[PDB]
Amino acid sequence: MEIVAPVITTFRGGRLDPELFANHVKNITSKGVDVVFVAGTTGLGPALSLQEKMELTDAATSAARRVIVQVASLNADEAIALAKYAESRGAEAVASLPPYYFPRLSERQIAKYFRDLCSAVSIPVFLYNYPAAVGRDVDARAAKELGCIRGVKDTNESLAHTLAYKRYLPQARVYNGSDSLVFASFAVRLDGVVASSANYLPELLAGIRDAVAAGDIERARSLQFLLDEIVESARHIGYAAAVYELVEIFQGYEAGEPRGPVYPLDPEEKAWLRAAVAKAKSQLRL
Amino acid sequence: MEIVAPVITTFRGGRLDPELFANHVKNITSKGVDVVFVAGTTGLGPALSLQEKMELTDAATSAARRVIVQVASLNADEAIALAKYAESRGAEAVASLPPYYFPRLSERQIAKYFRDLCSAVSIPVFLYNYPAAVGRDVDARAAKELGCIRGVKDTNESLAHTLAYKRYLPQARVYNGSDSLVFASFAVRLDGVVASSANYLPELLAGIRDAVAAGDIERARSLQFLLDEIVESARHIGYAAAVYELVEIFQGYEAGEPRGPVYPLDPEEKAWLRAAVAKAKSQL
Amino acid sequence: MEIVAPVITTFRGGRLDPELFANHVKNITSKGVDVVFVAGTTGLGPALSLQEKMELTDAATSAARRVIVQVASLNADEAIALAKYAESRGAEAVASLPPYYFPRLSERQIAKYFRDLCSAVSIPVFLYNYPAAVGRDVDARAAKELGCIRGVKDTNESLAHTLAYKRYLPQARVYNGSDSLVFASFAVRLDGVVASSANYLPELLAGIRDAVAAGDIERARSLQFLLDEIVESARHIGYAAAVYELVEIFQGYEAGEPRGPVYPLDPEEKAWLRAAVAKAKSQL
Amino acid sequence: MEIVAPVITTFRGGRLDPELFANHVKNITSKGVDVVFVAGTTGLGPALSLQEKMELTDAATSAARRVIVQVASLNADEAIALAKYAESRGAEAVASLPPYYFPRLSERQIAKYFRDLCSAVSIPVFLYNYPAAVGRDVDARAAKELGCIRGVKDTNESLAHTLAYKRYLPQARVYNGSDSLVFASFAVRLDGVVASSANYLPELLAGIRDAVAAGDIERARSLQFLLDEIVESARHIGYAAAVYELVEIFQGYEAGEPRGPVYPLDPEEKAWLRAAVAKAK
């Protein structure tokens, strides 16, 4: 079972900084991250231009052996274009959010989107389902009807919703994308987790996977609860920007910055976060 | 890890039939059910008069050794009165939904409700959280703050939400109440499940539990999917009435009927259901 | 266009004081309330026993010439009984919430509930739609499908949702149940409003209606915003209980009190609310 | 009180077509539309590149006297840059959706976004509130708190939510953005409506506005109800793409296409929509 990092996109000076990125990718993959999921929500995908996602694809694929590239764009030609680019850079799969933002697109329009994506590449296409962000759900039944989905990341608090894809798509690789379900996802044997904490605490996640494999549910759960406390703190000051600061706190290197409207934490917010997670990081030392 | 049955309330004619009820409890308790949860949502709790919940308490505490009685009422005095009655009948705990229907009660109100329940009895008071029905959530932080909650049934698709109660009340017994999470609940070692399907397929839930305990996570999951397929068909025509028909289908006896506004299935609905589950009743 | 009051249910001691209730009905019908809507949500309907609703039905039809009685119950038989009793005391119509609480209910079961209600009486049956409380919406299309709705009270922030019933049911009386849309509802010419604030500021509602008819939209809107400030303060400490206190504050007499789990405001909350509405009170 | 059109963006073969655009703009503005709201939701704004939004600003300011350009972008530098460009092109105001997509950004991040916009230009900045699409609400109190909002478009079925902006921001021009509230917006005297149907039936909106002003509430309402039946059919089929077909059907010229993932309607869908609306009273 895999630990997939939806890796952060590391800006410095308003532009992407590969190498902050690559040092980061190399760090986390050396600490239990199996797969790198680039241009995910944690990596600000919807906020990146096509060309930024191309740079990220190049940086991820040269820094890691297993890469999935998230390709959604509200211009579908760019999603197709990027899919092909990622495939040519050796990505093992591409993923896409359903068309987001626009309320009540039709089923036919969602279906054409994913079907054009499947036609464009030979590597597997994953559905990246994220109803809270996307404003729509593509559930297991709908994903099966698309007829080409070979993988799912379901960022969903409903573990049943995620398990349902293994039911309808017995051959698909199915992942839960929620940090609060990491323990549970290994326990029910999903194919893996895509968890944002894989950026700052991948060794905690591997700790959990190890515990679950050993049958040590008490340790798994307890490490989960620690992770939850950390997540909770970060949610409090704005989670997308806090991921970067947690990386620095936990991993000890410069992580770059997001870009607005996901503005970087200011120094007050960073000081606060650092204190907030110290209660629970002596409880750590992994 | 326990299988708790939110046992159906078994009307016949239009009135409670306590002997269908007891036959039913005795059967499922011999087929894997560890605790009877009387007057829950599946038992139509909120549609029942105080006297009816009383009669149902007598039947449960007669038919079964472990009974938790669900006492919520939109007259808090009837909740307290039933709690005391439940204890006097030998119930091992009582449980309550939070005050429901009325939007935006204050926290002081909700808290005074639970705290008045705790002070009325010496057996444990369980929170029964069911945001989708109740229209408000009392999460683990809120439950810890109530100060007297000894157990939780959380009917919630969000397993992390259920699991939080173990985080904040590690001494409480915490159960998840969604049928779609039975496998997962056992997998993550909650204290057990309260699942509507304990009425009609208790031995399937004991199977899932057994398989989880072996390590046949793959068997567990596969049993769970069988179970999801059945719940889905029943959801299609009205789950609350359909539970009664599923009991007949799988357990083989008369299950009585719900009471309107939860009207009993009509012949067409039953035939459809019978036919819809026949697909998966064979895969059993 | 009518001002309908969903009158509070006045408890003192733990029990209904129907003299309080009648003095309250008398006072507010003398100040611009046209219809009395008994036992709705503001009246703690779902929290009331059949006997409490019969008592309110008696006192209301005694103190007021136009009474709609809200009858919903999670025992459909009690709803039918109350409807029939309401007819017999001279209610001009009955209303019901759809079956609430239970999430797992079929259209057949909702349709049957209203149709049996329509069969039970000859006076009109209003749908009382209130999705946020009820957990279910019966929209205009669904309401037309029922084939017997003669009126609608739609407690809904979506004014379009409410207007939809006039489109789908042109002969029905359609009322909006939201305090924040009183001004809007008069402006679009719904048949009227059923507004909780009719308990405590019926003359503000009449002032809005006058202003709208005088084409003085700016005064209409400004009275509405004054109302909103008062409602928002009340919402902060627990709206259901605060309504009673607002009656005392603005009407000058003892309104009695709700009943737990809708516990009465405590003295600190009453004091807070009096001071919160004082700014807006002096500006009428 | 104004009729503001959140005007469709007219593509041909997935490329922007300024001539279709300009013809559509000139036509609807001669039939009642007072203001052109460019690159809003009906205009596929979040789907458009910066380049395309600049071309659209150019075409709209060249084809219409009053134009508000919607500038939201998930790269905030682009929103700022487009606000400056729109101002330089003579927009009477810029609007912005709050930052969208990303759940749970901080209030500080949202406030910074809007204030950076306000600082970037001298023309009014409008809040374009659309909780269903955006995933967050910037309500009247929050809007006042921003401290620089001078207009609001509120796409919201809750008319009271929209009227609250008039209470907290008495100088703000406030519009409701929902087609089903055109009649009610005029009746409660909001500053106007930004209704997607102004693309296809501007003269029906003008009619509702005239009926309200003449005290003819029963006509307003039944015109509103005619409109609701049309919108309902379009919704049934994919509203965003249906809008283009409705322009053609109702205004009698070509409207171009949307661009995928908002794919154009197919033949069967267009035929269904035509029948649905011919029947629609």
From Swiss-Prot, chain D:
It comes from Thermoproteus tenax. It is an enzyme of class 4 (lyase). It catalyses: 2-dehydro-3-deoxy-6-phospho-D-gluconate = D-glyceraldehyde 3-phosphate + pyruvate; 2-dehydro-3-deoxy-D-gluconate = D-glyceraldehyde + pyruvate. This is 2-dehydro-3-deoxy-D-gluconate/2-dehydro-3-deoxy-phosphogluconate aldolase. Belongs to the DapA family. KDPG aldolase subfamily. Pfam families: DHDPS. The record marks Y128 as: Proton shuttle. The keyword Lyase applies. It comes from the Archaea. Its EC number is 4.1.2.14, 4.1.2.51. Substrate binds at T41, T42, Y128, N129, Y130, K153, D154, T155. The lineage of its organism: Archaea, Thermoproteota, Thermoprotei, Thermoproteales, Thermoproteaceae.
